[PDB]
Design a protein around this motif. Structure first.
Motif, PDB file in Angstrom:
ATOM      1  N   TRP A  58       0.738  -1.465   0.171  1.00 14.46           N
ATOM      2  CA  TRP A  58      -0.049  -0.155  -0.103  1.00 14.46           C
ATOM      3  C   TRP A  58       0.757   1.147   0.042  1.00 14.46           C
ATOM      4  O   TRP A  58       0.467   2.362  -0.765  1.00 14.46           O
ATOM      5  CB  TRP A  58      -0.986  -0.083   1.363  1.00 14.46           C
ATOM      6  CG  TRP A  58      -2.105  -1.065   1.053  1.00 14.46           C
ATOM      7  CD1 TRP A  58      -2.131  -2.115   1.652  1.00 14.46           C
ATOM      8  CD2 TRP A  58      -3.048  -0.983   0.134  1.00 14.46           C
ATOM      9  NE1 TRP A  58      -3.282  -2.917   1.068  1.00 14.46           N
ATOM     10  CE2 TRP A  58      -3.766  -2.196   0.138  1.00 14.46           C
ATOM     11  CE3 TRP A  58      -3.581  -0.121  -0.935  1.00 14.46           C
ATOM     12  CZ2 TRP A  58      -5.125  -2.460  -0.561  1.00 14.46           C
ATOM     13  CZ3 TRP A  58      -4.743  -0.684  -1.701  1.00 14.46           C
ATOM     14  CH2 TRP A  58      -5.500  -1.597  -1.642  1.00 14.46           C
ATOM     15  N   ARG A  59       2.013   1.209   0.772  1.00 15.86           N
ATOM     16  CA  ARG A  59       2.829   2.564   0.784  1.00 15.86           C
ATOM     17  C   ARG A  59       3.452   2.816  -0.658  1.00 15.86           C
ATOM     18  O   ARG A  59       3.586   3.871  -0.821  1.00 15.86           O
ATOM     19  CB  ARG A  59       3.910   2.161   1.915  1.00 15.86           C
ATOM     20  CG  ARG A  59       4.909   3.418   1.949  1.00 15.86           C
ATOM     21  CD  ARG A  59       6.278   3.156   2.907  1.00 15.86           C
ATOM     22  NE  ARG A  59       5.545   2.610   4.256  1.00 15.86           N
ATOM     23  CZ  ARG A  59       5.220   3.567   5.140  1.00 15.86           C
ATOM     24  NH1 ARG A  59       5.291   5.000   4.995  1.00 15.86           N
ATOM     25  NH2 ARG A  59       4.875   3.093   6.322  1.00 15.86           N
ATOM     26  N   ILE A  67       0.465   4.315  -2.470  1.00 15.86           N
ATOM     27  CA  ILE A  67       0.263   5.782  -2.142  1.00 15.86           C
ATOM     28  C   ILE A  67       1.247   6.662  -2.606  1.00 15.86           C
ATOM     29  O   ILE A  67       0.800   7.991  -2.871  1.00 15.86           O
ATOM     30  CB  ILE A  67      -0.109   5.946  -0.489  1.00 15.86           C
ATOM     31  CG1 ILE A  67      -1.276   5.082  -0.316  1.00 15.86           C
ATOM     32  CG2 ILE A  67      -0.085   7.303  -0.305  1.00 15.86           C
ATOM     33  CD1 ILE A  67      -1.462   4.674   1.271  1.00 15.86           C
ATOM     34  N   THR A  72      -8.875   0.489  -5.997  1.00  7.19           N
ATOM     35  CA  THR A  72      -8.362   0.201  -4.610  1.00  7.19           C
ATOM     36  C   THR A  72      -9.438  -0.761  -4.287  1.00  7.19           C
ATOM     37  O   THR A  72      -8.808  -1.906  -3.502  1.00  7.19           O
ATOM     38  CB  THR A  72      -8.765   1.442  -3.894  1.00  7.19           C
ATOM     39  OG1 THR A  72      -7.790   2.423  -4.397  1.00  7.19           O
ATOM     40  CG2 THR A  72      -8.506   1.324  -2.536  1.00  7.19           C
ATOM     41  N   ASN A  87      -9.567   7.012  -0.284  1.00 13.94           N
ATOM     42  CA  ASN A  87      -9.129   7.754  -1.321  1.00 13.94           C
ATOM     43  C   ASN A  87      -9.587   9.530  -0.913  1.00 13.94           C
ATOM     44  O   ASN A  87      -8.716  10.119  -1.351  1.00 13.94           O
ATOM     45  CB  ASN A  87      -9.590   7.351  -2.820  1.00 13.94           C
ATOM     46  CG  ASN A  87      -9.073   6.331  -3.266  1.00 13.94           C
ATOM     47  OD1 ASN A  87      -8.262   6.622  -4.395  1.00 13.94           O
ATOM     48  ND2 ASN A  87      -9.239   5.172  -3.047  1.00 13.94           N
ATOM     49  N   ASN A 117      -6.896  10.799   1.398  1.00 14.52           N
ATOM     50  CA  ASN A 117      -5.817  10.955   0.702  1.00 14.52           C
ATOM     51  C   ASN A 117      -5.836  12.110  -0.143  1.00 14.52           C
ATOM     52  O   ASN A 117      -4.780  12.927   0.009  1.00 14.52           O
ATOM     53  CB  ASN A 117      -5.153   9.884  -0.034  1.00 14.52           C
ATOM     54  CG  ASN A 117      -4.772   8.427   0.398  1.00 14.52           C
ATOM     55  OD1 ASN A 117      -4.957   8.382   1.955  1.00 14.52           O
ATOM     56  ND2 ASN A 117      -4.166   7.790   0.146  1.00 14.52           N
ATOM     57  N   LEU A 136      -0.845   8.112   6.519  1.00 18.30           N
ATOM     58  CA  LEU A 136      -1.990   7.503   5.497  1.00 18.30           C
ATOM     59  C   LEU A 136      -1.603   6.201   5.680  1.00 18.30           C
ATOM     60  O   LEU A 136      -2.744   5.287   5.692  1.00 18.30           O
ATOM     61  CB  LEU A 136      -1.739   8.218   4.186  1.00 18.30           C
ATOM     62  CG  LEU A 136      -2.170   9.635   4.139  1.00 18.30           C
ATOM     63  CD1 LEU A 136      -2.106  10.225   2.742  1.00 18.30           C
ATOM     64  CD2 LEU A 136      -3.587   9.846   4.562  1.00 18.30           C
ATOM     65  N   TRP A 167      -4.737   3.208   6.197  1.00 18.54           N
ATOM     66  CA  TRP A 167      -5.077   2.380   5.310  1.00 18.54           C
ATOM     67  C   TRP A 167      -5.018   0.918   5.549  1.00 18.54           C
ATOM     68  O   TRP A 167      -5.947  -0.052   5.379  1.00 18.54           O
ATOM     69  CB  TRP A 167      -4.100   2.321   4.097  1.00 18.54           C
ATOM     70  CG  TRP A 167      -4.838   3.512   3.123  1.00 18.54           C
ATOM     71  CD1 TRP A 167      -4.882   4.946   3.354  1.00 18.54           C
ATOM     72  CD2 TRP A 167      -5.164   3.625   1.658  1.00 18.54           C
ATOM     73  NE1 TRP A 167      -5.369   5.584   2.276  1.00 18.54           N
ATOM     74  CE2 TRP A 167      -5.755   4.525   1.176  1.00 18.54           C
ATOM     75  CE3 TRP A 167      -5.373   2.319   0.939  1.00 18.54           C
ATOM     76  CZ2 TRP A 167      -6.187   4.894  -0.161  1.00 18.54           C
ATOM     77  CZ3 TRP A 167      -5.852   2.557  -0.366  1.00 18.54           C
ATOM     78  CH2 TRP A 167      -6.169   3.758  -0.712  1.00 18.54           C
TER      79      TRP A 167
END
Ligand SMILES: CC1CCN(C(=O)NC2CCCCCC2)CC1
Ligand SMILES: CC1CCN(C(=O)NC2CCCCCC2)CC1
Lengths: 193, 193
Positions: free
Chosen positions: B82-83, B86, B128, B155, B158, B182, B186
């Motif tokens: 995920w990192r 993002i 996502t 989303n 973010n 974030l 998440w």
């Protein structure tokens, strides 16, 4: 006196349900409030100032409701505690969608609206962080992210998500699902490791 | 030809670092690009159209980077997965803060900018939700909230959080802490029960 003022505010809130502030005239607001244009200008310098006052009223209404809750804890679990809190904002802003919508837009345009919004967001984030800290101190929540940073992002999430839902933006969470969605993310992010 | 076009876009992006679109003139953009005002109008109908093009370029750049990542999974844990995702948005928009800032503001004002933003947000939310669904199907994530609703709120979080950080809004998460903040929210919200 402040009856004419209240009539002006009531007219503006009614008119904002139908159209944006740009398409509302001082003559429109004067007419609805049963006063003349110069009498309007006695009570408000501009239509923009009318919106600022309406938003101030809504933001303080939310704040006072949160203060009431803060002094009067409901006897529940952690999930319900956060839900009741988020619900203050859902109901308050949700009861004033036209003012919310116009007031968010006015941030781009108005230093006073931007500062009003900023002041109260800082207060609500600080309160959020204080509750998370209390939860950590009592051993109910793990020490993960900096609480003020976590609080900031969760508050911004709620701002953007609630307001998109209220405005019926594409994309948005359906209004009837937005409270459950936010509570989930708050609880998992605050209590999770 | 499209050299003059690129010069106009480069001038606009440079000028937007110093001031808003409102305080930039066609004469300003023509001058910076080394062309006349009518020659400008050959390439763009308005300064507003210049911004639309710059935002289109940034949004597609992010989208293409995400597509590349989607075809080329890094070999990591779920947090890192995920990192990295993002981070595509952090780096792309973060490399174009003036365009991001002006483009977000233009949503209020421009149906085409609003629709551009809306189109890509819908795409990124769908992607996502598809990843969350895959994670649930593989038994890595619990079946909690409706995945598309969860995806939507995350989303929107973010969007609001990244852009507040980039603009240095009060309140905001410091830019150097926004990715960790974030990613935490998440991962805990997607994997937590
Ligand atoms: C104890 C907390 C206090 C803050 N909370 C909020 O929802 N705040 C947001 C509401 C959305 C509208 C903008 C303001 C931020 C949750 C409950
Ligand atoms: C696999 C996902 C795809 C979507 N992601 C996003 O950050 N999207 C947001 C970025 C902020 C700017 C607005 C767009 C929404 C995380 C990675």
């Amino acid at each position: 006196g402040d009856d004419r003022e209240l009539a002006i505010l009531a007219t503006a809130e009614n008119l904002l349900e139908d159209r944006p502030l740009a398409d509302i005239s001082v003559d429109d607001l004067a007419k609805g409030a049963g006063i003349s244009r110069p009498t309007f200008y006695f009570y408000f310098p501009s239509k923009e100032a009318v919106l600022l006052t309406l938003l101030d009223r809504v933001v303080n209404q939310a704040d006072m409701a949160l203060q009431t809750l803060a002094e009067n804890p409901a006897d529940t679990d952690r999930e319900n505690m956060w839900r009741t809190g988020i619900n203050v904002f859902f109901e308050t802003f949700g009861s004033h969608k036209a003012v919310t919508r116009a007031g968010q837009a006015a941030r781009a345009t108005s230093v006073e609206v931007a500062e009003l919004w900023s002041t109260f967001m800082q207060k609500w984030i600080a309160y959020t962080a204080a509750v998370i800290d209390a939860e950590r101190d009592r051993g109910a929540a793990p020490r993960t992210l900096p609480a003020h940073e976590l609080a900031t992002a969760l508050n911004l999430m709620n701002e953007r998500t609630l307001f998109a839902s209220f405005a019926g933006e594409q994309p948005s969470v359906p209004e009837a699902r937005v409270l459950d969605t936010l509570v989930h993310i708050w609880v998992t992010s605050i209590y999770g490791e």
